[PDB]
């Protein structure tokens, strides 16, 4: 959380190629979706709120 | 055959440690218990504990914890059913943690 | 008639022809997409980058 | 097309949630011929959620 998003995109690429193929899959999934909670309020708010 | 305790579209299979066979071909099975979502034939041997819809244990409670067994496998098992699985998981995170 | 394949045929002799260093890795390329057809299932488990 | 466009708002709330209920009862659907218990409580939450 505490970088610049320019580092952010690379450094989240990074652990999703190299630490997932020995991570259980619940672990996967909250970071996924952690990672992926800002736009779900946006796409709510945009298309589906109304 | 083995001992049946329930029978129609949902199957509960209680089997010794013997060669249970049928008309056709006959494979060896250990004790326990199995239960199945389909009519489908079921056994403790190998090559049965893969198929989806087959769950199986050691005993009552052995089948009960067994079947959450995939939930802490890594990802790449499961391929059309992983959507209610994720989300299974997703509810119960996202309530727990925002509310609570 | 059906003459794809030697449609197909003449334009790898023709790239055989112009002869030049990157013809190698496209050889290579195609040498293995023919070999990944037939063995296949044989090799691929669990990993999902692979 | 501008006017289908202009009138098009009005029922869009209604469609974006319906595109997503479309795609949910697909999944549940293309589910069914394993685990074949779901429908019944699938159209018991259907109804609950309705």
Redesign the interface.
Same mark, same amino acid.
């Given at each position: 959380f505490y970088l610049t998003n320019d580092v952010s995109f690379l450094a989240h690429i990074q652990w999703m190629v190299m630490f997932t193929p020995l991570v259980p899959f619940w672990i996967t999934i909250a970071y996924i979706i952690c990672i992926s909670t800002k736009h779900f309020y946006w796409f709510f708010s945009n298309?589906?709120k109304? | 055959f083995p001992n049946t305790y329930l029978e129609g579209?949902?199957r509960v299979v209680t089997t010794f440690d013997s060669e249970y066979c049928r008309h056709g071909t006959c494979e060896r099975s250990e004790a326990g218990v199995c239960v199945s979502?389909?009519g489908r034939w079921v056994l403790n041997n190998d090559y049965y504990r893969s198929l989806?819809?087959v769950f199986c244990g050691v005993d009552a409670v052995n089948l009960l914890t067994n079947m959450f067994t995939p939930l802490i496998q890594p990802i790449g098992a499961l391929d059309?059913?992983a959507?209610?699985v994720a989300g299974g998981i997703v509810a119960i995170v996202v309530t727990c943690l925002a509310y609570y | 008639w059906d003459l794809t394949a030697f449609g197909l045929v003449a334009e790898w002799f023709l790239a055989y022809i112009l002869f030049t260093r990157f013809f190698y890795v496209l050889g290579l390329a195609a040498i293995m997409q023919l070999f990944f057809s037939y063995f296949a299932v044989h090799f691929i488990s669990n990993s999902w980058l692979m | 097309f501008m006017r289908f466009r202009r009138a098009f708002g009005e029922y &869009?709330?209604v469609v974006?949630?319906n595109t997503?209920l479309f795609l949910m009862s697909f999944?549940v659907l293309?589910?069914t011929p394993?685990? &074949?218990?779901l429908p019944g409580v699938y159209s018991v939450i259907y109804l609950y959620l309705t």
């Open positions: 298309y589906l109304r | 579209s949902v979502t389909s989806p819809g059309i059913s959507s209610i | - | &869009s709330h974006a949630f997503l999944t293309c589910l394993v685990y &074949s218990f």
